[PDB]
Every structure is written in C-alpha cells, then in structure tokens.
Write a protein that binds this ligand. Structure first.
Ligand SMILES: [Cs+]
Ligand SMILES: [Cs+]
Ligand SMILES: [Cs+]
Ligand SMILES: [Cs+]
Ligand SMILES: [Cs+]
Ligand SMILES: [Cs+]
Ligand SMILES: [Cs+]
Ligand SMILES: [Cs+]
Ligand SMILES: [Cs+]
Ligand SMILES: [Cs+]
Ligand SMILES: [Cs+]
Ligand SMILES: [Cs+]
Ligand SMILES: [Cs+]
Ligand SMILES: [Cs+]
Ligand SMILES: [Cs+]
Ligand SMILES: [Cs+]
Ligand SMILES: [Cs+]
Ligand SMILES: [Cs+]
Ligand SMILES: [Cs+]
Ligand SMILES: [Cs+]
Lengths: 190, 190
C-alpha cells in the first residue's frame, strides 16, 4: 500500500527530471533522451491516476475533501509541466531543424546542461553517485549517463561510475567546468 | 536593441525561479512570495511578447520562418510552465488550508527548499553572492532573501549577506543542512 506522499514525491521528482532531459535532448539533438521523456510522461499520468485514486478514497468529511483538493490542484500543475516537457521532447523526435539560439540558450543560462567525459585517472572512477553526492558536494546534478550504447536515466545512489562514462549533469557553468576537470583527473580532490 | 537570445535566456531563468518560489510560498504559506510569482508571470508574458516581436520581424525566407517557429514553440512550453507556477501561487494567495502532505513533500523530495538563518559569527557575513557562488561551491541555490520586513527575490551577484538575513535556497537536503551550519558559524570554511 503506497501513500499519497510516496506517489506525490515521485511525481515531483520525475517531472523535475523530465524538464531537465527535455533540455538535454534539445541541446544534443538526442532522440533517445527525447523518447525517455515521453515514457516518463506516461509514468506521470499513471502516478497522477494513482494519486487521484488514493485521494478520492481518502476524503471522509467536508474539511478533508477540501484538503484532498489542494493536492489534486497541485498534481494538476505538475501535470501541466510534464506535458510542456513532452512538447520540447517531440520537437527533437520530429527531427525539426532547431534555431541556433536554442542550444546557446541552454548553454548560457544561470543553470546549464553539460556533458562530462570520465577518464581512467579520474578520482571518481569506482565511486557510486550515492557515495559521491555531486549534487551535494559540487552542486552538479547527474540526470543521465551514456555508458557506451546505453543510457542510464535518473541514476540512483548505487550507480557506480566507470572510465568512459559520459555524465550528463545540470548545474551552473562554473560547477560544470570544475566537475569536468575532476573527471579528466586534473583535480584529485572532491 | 535586445537580441532573441537575451530575451529567451531571461524567460528560462525567470520561469525556473518562478517554479522555485511557487514551492517556497506553498511551504511557508507566504503570501508575499506568492505575489512575487504572479508579478513574474506578467514579466514572462511581456518577454514572450517581445520574443514574438523579434522572431516575427526576423524571418526573411521559408527556412528561417521554419526555425523562428521552433523558438516560439519552446517559448510556448516555457509559457505553460509559468502559468502552472502561477496556479500554485494562487492557492497560497487564496489562503486555502493545505493538506499536510504538501509541505512534507517539498521538504522530502530529491531537491528541497530550505530556510537559512545567518548569524553574526558566520564566515559568509560580508560576502556577496557573486563572490560566494553557493550554487557553485555548495550546490545550494539562493532564490530569495528575507531581510527583516523586505524580500529580495532572485538576488544577484552584488547582493551582500548580512547577519540576520534569512536565506531561501534550493538544493538537496544534505546541501541545505550543511549550508545551515556554515551560517550558524559552526563551519568556518566554505
Ligand atoms: Cs544528434
Ligand atoms: Cs503527462
Ligand atoms: Cs470518499
Ligand atoms: Cs492538467
Ligand atoms: Cs492545461
Ligand atoms: Cs534536427
Ligand atoms: Cs564541497
Ligand atoms: Cs534509474
Ligand atoms: Cs534517482
Ligand atoms: Cs566514451
Ligand atoms: Cs505563514
Ligand atoms: Cs505567464
Ligand atoms: Cs518577416
Ligand atoms: Cs502557452
Ligand atoms: Cs496550454
Ligand atoms: Cs492557509
Ligand atoms: Cs566545494
Ligand atoms: Cs533581483
Ligand atoms: Cs539573478
Ligand atoms: Cs532575522
């Protein structure tokens, strides 16, 4: 038996990832990332359905119905951000020629998206994301990892980095360049 | 003369802030933060109008019209995320009783929102955000600052921290607790 909070947290955590990937796919014109986004859009509809199922069954009296509505209302805004993400994804899958200012805009905002190469020498090779907490210890958020021909989306704390992995992360420009050097093996301390 | 990129970057940077504040206002039931969000919603419509004005005037031939459309299309998704943020803000301004799982959900997601007290002893007192780059050097994003009776939203790199300021930031739970100790003066190094 899942809780409303459980379901709700995954919705928020998933849509945050979806918006990040929609931008990743636009920047790299990557159709596989774009397709991950639409799969996630489905999971959101499924989570929202379940949130409604729990919510509806839970209101006993008037005051509680009133509250259960504030939840649906928020899940609705999350729902709208999810479809918006899907929209950006479709543009990539459609294969339309993107105006150059789009990729530059994603690389020059307060928070950009960056691609990081991991070298054999890097002090992070062998460390899990959990152990590392780059989000925590570097402000760079790892949203995906291209390990050869495969993609690991929304990797967890168990995921262990290998030389050759290409980290896809979000953070400030400075956060990303820094992290890149830690990955070339230029910076031996994290 | 502004450029399309200029306008576009502010749109993306502003909506990212709006979503962050919509959550801040929900968590603290703060009506002033909520009202900032709606003011920002207006600025987005204004930026989008200008983006359209530039875009429309810029397409010379067919291929270029095609590209200018990919821009409008994205500005449209940004537009939808902005209205979604406004929706969350309205719930706070409406003063409706929020279901308890909402504030817990904002405090228990991958990325939470936190309130940070700055003490006289803190090594950050006297430092500008620019100089500091907490986003960069700590992964905590400062989205607003309650300095007494006033709010500084989306503070820039010039903003200089004072004892007594209450920093509103976004980051992982660990990033936020850490930053809190640097603010109590418990941790003398950043
Ligand atoms: Cs490509
Ligand atoms: Cs959806
Ligand atoms: Cs019921
Ligand atoms: Cs909706
Ligand atoms: Cs809608
Ligand atoms: Cs393309
Ligand atoms: Cs650190
Ligand atoms: Cs995963
Ligand atoms: Cs995850
Ligand atoms: Cs590689
Ligand atoms: Cs309040
Ligand atoms: Cs708007
Ligand atoms: Cs024209
Ligand atoms: Cs729209
Ligand atoms: Cs819409
Ligand atoms: Cs309230
Ligand atoms: Cs650091
Ligand atoms: Cs500002
Ligand atoms: Cs700013
Ligand atoms: Cs204070």
């Amino acid at each position: 038996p899942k809780s409303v909070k459980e379901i709700f947290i995954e919705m928020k955590d998933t849509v945050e990832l979806m918006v990040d990937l929609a931008y990743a796919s636009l920047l790299f014109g990557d159709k596989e990332i774009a397709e991950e986004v639409l799969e996630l859009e489905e999971r959101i509809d499924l989570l929202n359905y379940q949130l409604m199922m729990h919510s509806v069954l839970a209101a006993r009296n008037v005051k509680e119905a009133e509250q259960v509505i504030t939840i649906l209302q928020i899940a609705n805004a999350i729902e709208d951000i999810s479809n918006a993400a899907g929209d950006l994804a479709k543009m990539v899958l459609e294969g339309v020629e993107l105006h150059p200012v789009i990729k530059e805009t994603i690389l020059e905002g307060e928070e950009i998206i960056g691609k990081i190469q991991v070298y054999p020498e890097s002090v992070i090779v062998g460390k899990t994301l959990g152990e590392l907490d780059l989000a925590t210890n570097t402000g760079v958020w790892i949203i995906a990892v291209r390990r050869g021909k495969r993609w690991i989306f929304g990797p967890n704390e168990n995921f262990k980095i290998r030389a050759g992995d290409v980290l896809i992360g979000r953070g400030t420009r400075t956060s990303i360049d820094h992290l890149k050097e830690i990955a070339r093996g230029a910076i031996r301390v994290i």
